From a paper:
Here, we characterize the O-methyltransferases BelI and CysG, which catalyze the initial step of β-lactone formation. Employing techniques such as crystallography, computational analysis, mutagenesis, and activity assays, we identified a His-His-Asp (HHD) motif in the active sites of the two enzymes, which is crucial for binding a catalytically active calcium ion. As expected, BelI as well as CysGΔN16 adopt the class I methyltransferase Rossmann fold, characterized by a core domain of a seven-stranded β-sheet flanked by α-helices. The HHD-motif enables regiospecific C1-carboxy group methylation of their respective malic substrates.
Conservative asparagine replacements in the HHD motif resulted in CysG variants that remained active. CysGfl-D191N showed a 56% decrease in substrate turnover, while CysGfl-H122N and CysGfl-H123N were fully active compared to wt but were inactivated with EDTA. Strikingly, the CysGfl-H123N variant showed 91% of the original catalytic activity with Ca2+, whereas Mg2+ and Mn2+ resulted in only 50% residual activity. Analysis of the complex geometry in high-resolution structures, X-ray fluorescence measurements, as well as metal-dependent activity assays with the CysGfl-H123N variant indicate Ca2+ as the intrinsically bound metal ion.
Residue numbers in the entry: 17 to 229
The structure:
């Protein structure tokens, strides 16, 4: 029901979440330590667990209500832990092989995003990876309208309940997105040696930074 609704609301769900899982699996060992930042109900963590049965997952979010859904999802998983913390709070020490996030960091002020990327690099092993599945802003107001039309086209084609899309729109009024190339450059500024946009469907993109490679 919830997982079904996320697919209705998010264009190219399988491509974007799948790209995050694939780039992690090609970058870290089977026994990787992975932090999911803003894990919510643990959808990205769940996608990673499907590919990496031996990975240790730490799911972090500020919302206990969202993390209760993650606890239920991972009830029988002995290699999953949960941490309640804001992105702006001290990160867990790690070190981590991967830090991943989906549709969470766009909630922060731009300065706090730039600082967060730097703080993430500090808890990554050398050669570690940061991956973000993100809601991104178009580089112009005219393109932003086209991004919006493409998002709405997916939502309508997916037979999304009108009430859930209306609720989606209200949530998006408080979002602080920026264009994908600005954020990717912030990874370079944070001291990641490589940063790339792996996959994109207009408003939604999967990008990554590597801590040494
Ligand atoms: N400043 C902040 N610190 C921590 N978590 C935050 C946050 N701002 C938003 N969040 C969390 O980010 C999540 C956004 S929804 C995305 C959930 C999950 N990553 C998924 O892919 O489905 C929510 O769980 C919300 O509580």
């Amino acid at each position: 029901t919830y997982d079904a609704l996320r697919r209705q609301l998010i264009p190219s769900f399988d491509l974007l979440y799948g790209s995050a899982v694939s780039v992690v699996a090609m970058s870290v060992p089977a026994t990787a330590r992975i932090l999911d930042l803003g894990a919510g109900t643990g959808l990205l963590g769940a996608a990673l667990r499907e590919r990496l049965p031996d990975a240790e997952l730490l799911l972090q979010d500020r919302s206990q209500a969202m993390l209760e859904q993650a606890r239920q999802r991972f009830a029988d998983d002995d290699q999953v832990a949960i941490r309640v913390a804001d992105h702006l709070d001290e990160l867990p020490a790690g070190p981590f092989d991967a830090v991943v996030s989906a549709l969470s960091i766009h909630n922060l002020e731009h300065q706090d995003k730039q600082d967060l990327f730097t703080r993430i690099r500090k808890i990554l092993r050398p050669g570690g990876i940061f991956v973000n599945v993100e809601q991104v802003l178009a580089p112009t107001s005219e393109l932003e309208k086209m991004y919006d039309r493409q998002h709405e086209a997916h939502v309508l084609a997916s037979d999304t309940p009108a009430e859930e899309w209306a609720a989606g729109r209200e949530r998006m009024k408080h979002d602080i997105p920026i264009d994908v190339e600005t954020q990717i450059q912030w990874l370079r500024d944070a001291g990641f040696t490589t940063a790339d946009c792996l996959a994109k469907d207009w408003r939604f993109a999967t990008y990554a930074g590597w801590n040494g490679s």
